Amino acid sequence: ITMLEDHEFVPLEVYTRHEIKDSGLLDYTEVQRRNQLHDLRFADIDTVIHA
Amino acid sequence: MYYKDVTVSQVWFGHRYSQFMGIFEDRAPVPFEEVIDKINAKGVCRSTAKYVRNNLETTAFHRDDHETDMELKPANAATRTSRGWHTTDLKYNPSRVEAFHR
Amino acid sequence: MYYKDVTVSQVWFGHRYSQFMGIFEDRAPVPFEEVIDKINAKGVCRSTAKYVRNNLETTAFHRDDHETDMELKPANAATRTSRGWHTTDLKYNPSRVEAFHR
Amino acid sequence: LGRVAIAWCELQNHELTLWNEARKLNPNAIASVTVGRRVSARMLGDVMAVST
C-alpha cells in the first residue's frame, strides 16, 4: 500500500477574462475614449479667438 | 489613417455679439497620390481635400484660402495617447462682420 | 451634469407647407458662477449659454428672446428613469413666413 | 489505507505465533506453503529443515 502523492492544481483557463473581453472586434469604452479624446488631441479646446 | 476633418460652421454675428448656427463636421479621404507624394515623402499635406460626399465631388480649402501645403506636425500628447498627427491645431472661424451669416 | 441643449434649426417655409433644412443639436456647458448661484440656490437657470465651442465664444438665447431666468422643473417620468430636470419642455421653432429661410 | 497497512503488519506479526504453533503441528504442509513449493519438512527444533 503506497500513499497517494500530493498534487498541486495550478490555476488554468483557456480564456481569461482579459482575452474574452478582447475577443470582441470593437470595445465601446475604448472606442468612445479615443473618439472623445480626438477633439482634445487634434484641436485646441481652450484657445479663444475674438476679432 | 489619412483623413482630413473637413468642418464648416455658419455663424451669426449679431448686433452686439456672435453666435453659432451649425457646424458640419465631416471626415474626408485623401488621394493615393497625395499620400504617396506629400504625406510619406515630404511629410506635408495639402490645404485642400478632394473627396466624394453625397454622390458629389467636393473640395474644402483650409481657412478658405488658396491651396497650400502645411507642415504636418505631431499632436499634443494626452493621457494614454498613441502617436497622432495633424496639420492644424486651431479651427478657422469667420471674421466678425455685423448682421451677416458668414 | 449641468448642460444646455442648444439646438438651432433652419426651416423652409414654402408657399403651401413647411420643411426642415437642418437641426444643429449641441450640448453646452454652464459657468461655475451660474451653477453656484442660479442653479443650486435659486433653483433656476438662465435662458442663455455662455460657452466656447469650435474655438469661439457663442451664446444662444432660448426662443431667440432677451435673457431671462427660466424656472427649472422636473422632467416627465418615463420607464426606468432617474431624477432629471429641464427648464423647457417644447423646442422653439421659427414662426411661419412665406418663402423665407427662418 | 495507512491504517489498513498498519493493521496488516500487526496481523502478520500477531499471527506469527499461530504460524509457529502450526509449524510445530504440521511441518510438511506449513513449510510447503511458506516456501511456495510442495516440500517435506522435519523436526525444526527452532528452524525448519526442509527437503524437496
* C-alpha closest to that of B15 among B83, B100, B102: B100
8-state DSSP, B64: G
Beta strands C3-13; B85-86: pairing state: unpaired
CB contact (8 A) between residue A42 and residue B81: no
Measured CA to CA in angstroms, residue B100 lies from B95, C74, C98, D50 at distances of 10, 38, 21, 132
| Ordered alpha helix ranges (H), chain B | 32-34
Quote the cell numbers at residue C11.
Answer: 426651416
Query: Which residues of chain D make contact with A1, given a CB cutoff of 8 A?
Result: 1-2, 4-5, 8
Method for structure elucidation: cryo-EM
CB C45 within 8 A of CB C34: yes
**Helix pair D2-25, D27-35: axis angle to 10 deg:** 140
At residue B41, φ and ψ (nearest 5 deg) are: -80, -60
Cα(A21)–Cα(B20) distance, rounded to whole angstroms? 41
**CB-based burial, C13-31: b 16+ in 10 Å, e otherwise:** beeeeeeeeeebebebbbe
Quote the cell numbers at residue C38.
Answer: 442660479
- Count Cβ–Cβ pairs < 8 Å, chain A vs chain B: 26
At residue C59, φ and ψ (nearest 5 deg) are: -130, 150
Best residue of C50, C56, C58, C59 to probe chain A, by most A CBs closer than 10 Å: C56
Cα R_g (chain B), whole angstroms: 16
Cα(C72)–Cα(A12) distance, rounded to whole angstroms? 56
Three-state SS letters, chain A: CCCCCCCCCCCCCCCCHHHHHHHCCCCHHHHHHHHHHHHHHHCCCCCCCCC
Resolution in A: 3.0
Beta strands B85-86; B73-74: pairing state: antiparallel
